[PDB]
């Protein structure tokens, strides 16, 4: 009865949106940066190497002071490193050894991790006694966790494989708000610098922009072909870059609501695992499944260098706050710190 | 270096000494992955060899420590987390014999014994489990005996072409699950007809694990 006309109205609305999107597209960004001096050549060498994980490494996160580090492996261990001296500060054992995410609080007091048990655990690093202990366990997801980010010392946002994202309240342990609209597993998160919006990439080959305070979707971006594995925000806060399994990375713009450029090659056939930017936004580092890591000119799409030092595939990648170093993790159980 | 960094170095040395000590305690264990489809009898299997997300079980038989991970309560995409389990000693598969006469609930044009075959075909031929053996369990055999007299096996496969007896049907069913393996040069499949049996269920697993370990040791010399 009314289903057919509802479908027709939805199709015409989508056509109208695409028509407006095409009409507002004046010219490509490549023409503008035609007369821009290229970066040249980028050379980086391994300055530090950290060992101690007897298993695959799945995630890492940099501290807010650009000195401390957190890593999580499927051996059931959470290690806090001191990057300057390659020292060990803490070693936390997990109840379940199937962990696939970790995070570091901006204040430096808390650390969170989650995995295949559908539970996010929060640890306290500054107890009165000389040990760490679980402070709160959050439950309510019906699927494995994928990402974890700290808004502040009392708020946290998680994404799981049940096609939902939620905003928690650590003190009470209850979900303040829930986000719906994805038709596939959600695999990544990225908090805006203003800490007012965030983006998520799902397995249905799409990305969405959420509003933390109103709890509603504002924009959705398409253009990928297979699946989205990583996402990251531009330092300006008006753009983001994604990474997929089709072996392509794309840059999207919020204000124009389109796609600007793509980062593809011909000798690359494996999917992207992680994506990160630079302090100024001139470079874009993306880990790959073929044990290598590439550096792309963000405004020209030219490979500036290669970071090849790992035996197995690269799973995690991060850049310090001040932009003085970049750390890489892999399935060969070694963390390497590179510098320029 | 300055009377406050040597303490950091010794603390880190204690930390990684404890890490190394704890690492080798979990290396002398056998890890098994339990799979199946629906109510094929995983609960009965766990009851025969016993002591939301991932469920874990521990049990010891003859000074071998066993760990079994049940992942039947995920309902998510298997592709995104199946590579976490690469490296397990063996995979346990549970099949219900008394399923040829029954079909799915929400779908009528789908035999319940074909979805199990599809799942076995998908699991056996994977890029991560090329060198991992499979232990196959056919659970409900008494009810199969009860229903085989009146109902024929031709409903599932209209090519059985044999007398409706126990042996000629059970052998055919076992064969139907064994040519789905297209990696005969590197994989082995162990089958066991059991139904509310005794310690026979645990002894078979012990023997299969011993055989797998011996063959793995032999393969390191280029001699097998």
């Amino acid at each position, epitope marked *: 009865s009314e289903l057919d006309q509802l479908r027709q109205e939805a199709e015409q609305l989508k056509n109208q949106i695409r028509d407006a999107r095409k009409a507002c597209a004046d010219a490509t960004l490549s023409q503008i940066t035609n007369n821009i001096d290229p970066v040249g050549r980028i050379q980086m060498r391994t300055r530090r190497t950290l060992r101690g994980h007897l298993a695959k490494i799945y995630a890492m996160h940099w501290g807010t002071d650009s000195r401390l580090l957190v890593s999580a492996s499927q051996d059931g261990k959470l290690i806090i490193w001191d990057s300057y001296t390659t020292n060990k500060v803490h070693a936390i054992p997990l109840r379940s050894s199937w962990v696939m995410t970790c995070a570091y609080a901006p204040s430096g007091n808390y650390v969170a991790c989650g995995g295949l048990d559908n539970i996010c655990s929060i640890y306290n690093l500054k107890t009165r*006694e000389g040990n760490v202990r679980v402070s709160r366990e959050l439950a309510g997801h019906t699927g494995y966790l994928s990402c974890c980010r700290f808004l502040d010392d009392n708020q946290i946002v998680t994404s799981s494989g049940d096609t939902t994202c939620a905003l928690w309240d650590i003190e009470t342990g209850q979900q303040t708000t829930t986000f719906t609209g994805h038709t596939g597993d959600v695999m990544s998160l990225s908090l805006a610098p203003d800490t007012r919006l965030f983006v998520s990439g799902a397995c249905d080959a799409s990305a969405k922009l959420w509003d933390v305070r109103e709890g509603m979707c504002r924009q959705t971006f398409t253009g990928h072909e297979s699946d989205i594995n990583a996402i990251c925000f531009f330092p300006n806060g008006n753009a983001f870059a994604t990474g997929s399994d089709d072996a392509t990375c794309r840059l999207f713009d919020l204000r124009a609501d389109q796609e600007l450029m793509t980062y593809s090659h011909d000798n690359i056939i494996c999917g992207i695992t992680s994506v990160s930017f630079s302090k100024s936004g001139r470079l874009l580092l993306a880990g790959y499944d073929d044990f290598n890591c590439n550096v792309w000119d963000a405004l020209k799409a030219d490979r500036a260098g290669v970071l090849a030092g790992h035996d197995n595939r690269v799973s995690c990648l991060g850049v310090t706050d001040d932009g003085m170093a970049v750390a890489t993790g892999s399935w060969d159980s070694f963390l390497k710190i590179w510098n320029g | 270096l*300055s009377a406050e960094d040597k303490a950091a170095v*010794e*603390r880190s040395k*204690m930390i990684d000494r404890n890490l190394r000590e704890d690492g080798e305690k979990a290396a002398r264990e056998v890890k098994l992955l339990l799979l199946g489809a629906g109510e094929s009898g995983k609960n009965t299997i766990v009851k025969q060899m016993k002591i939301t997300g991932i469920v874990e079980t521990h049990f010891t038989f003859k000074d071998l420590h066993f760990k079994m991970f049940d992942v039947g309560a995920q309902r998510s995409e298997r592709k995104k987390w199946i590579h976490c389990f690469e490296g397990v000693t063996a995979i346990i598969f549970c099949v219900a014999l008394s399923d040829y006469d029954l079909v799915l609930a929400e779908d009528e044009e789908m035999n319940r014994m074909h979805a199990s075959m599809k799942l076995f075909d998908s699991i056996c031929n994977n890029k991560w489990f090329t060198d991992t053996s499979i232990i196959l369990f056919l659970n409900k055999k008494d009810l199969f005996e009860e229903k085989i007299k009146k109902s024929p096996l031709t409903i599932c496969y209209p090519e059985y072409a044999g007398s409706n007896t126990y042996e000629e049907a059970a052998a055919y069913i076992q064969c139907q699950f064994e040519d789905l393996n297209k990696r005969k040069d590197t994989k082995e499949i162990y089958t066991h007809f059991t139904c509310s049996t005794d310690t026979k269920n645990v002894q078979f697993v012990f023997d299969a694990v011993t055989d797998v370990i011996i063959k793995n040791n032999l393969k390191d010399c280029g001699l097998f």
Partner: single-chain antibody
Amino acid sequence: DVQLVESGGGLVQPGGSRKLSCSASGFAFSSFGMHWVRQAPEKGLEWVAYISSGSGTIYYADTVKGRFTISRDDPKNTLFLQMTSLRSEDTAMYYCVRSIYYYGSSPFDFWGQGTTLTVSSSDIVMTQATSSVPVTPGESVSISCRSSKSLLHSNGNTYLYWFLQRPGQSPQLLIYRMSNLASGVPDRFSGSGSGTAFTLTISRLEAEDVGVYYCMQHLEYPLTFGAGTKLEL
């Protein structure tokens, strides 16, 4: 809920033998190094010995080595100090201090009550400019001290500590590394320094703030304590 219990003491003849005992509870005793600090009557504190976690490092004072030993018991959470070859100059009350060392830790945070011990009858030096300074209520005053050797290291971290002892009470940690405020201390206190001269600044002095202040160094062993400054109204 950190609690400290000590056993042993009393008058004894010179050359006697005994053992000083300590009890710990409410915290992980196996992850903390321990120190022994004594204070003779009408005298300042004096570092005695140090033992690290795992009993891998032991140190003794110049006038203490040879006639003293230290030990710990992890299962019982007990600390020991055997007494032998005693002299008449060892009449002091012995304290127990816990310390943990990693990136960002604050050692010497908790001090024990201590037990009284009495018998029957180079290196960096800490110097305080003034022995006793009068205090005007409701105003702001400062305490300054200097050292013979600079306490600034290559890594950029300096090792200067401030301790306050209330009249008839155990001392507590105020400021560590001359610029960091310990937990549980009000923001009135503020530490400062530059290279070799260090001054402690107080926003306002109250009735509780009266006490005796001490200065410490941790660049190398032994640990030297400056003479306490008597705050008089």
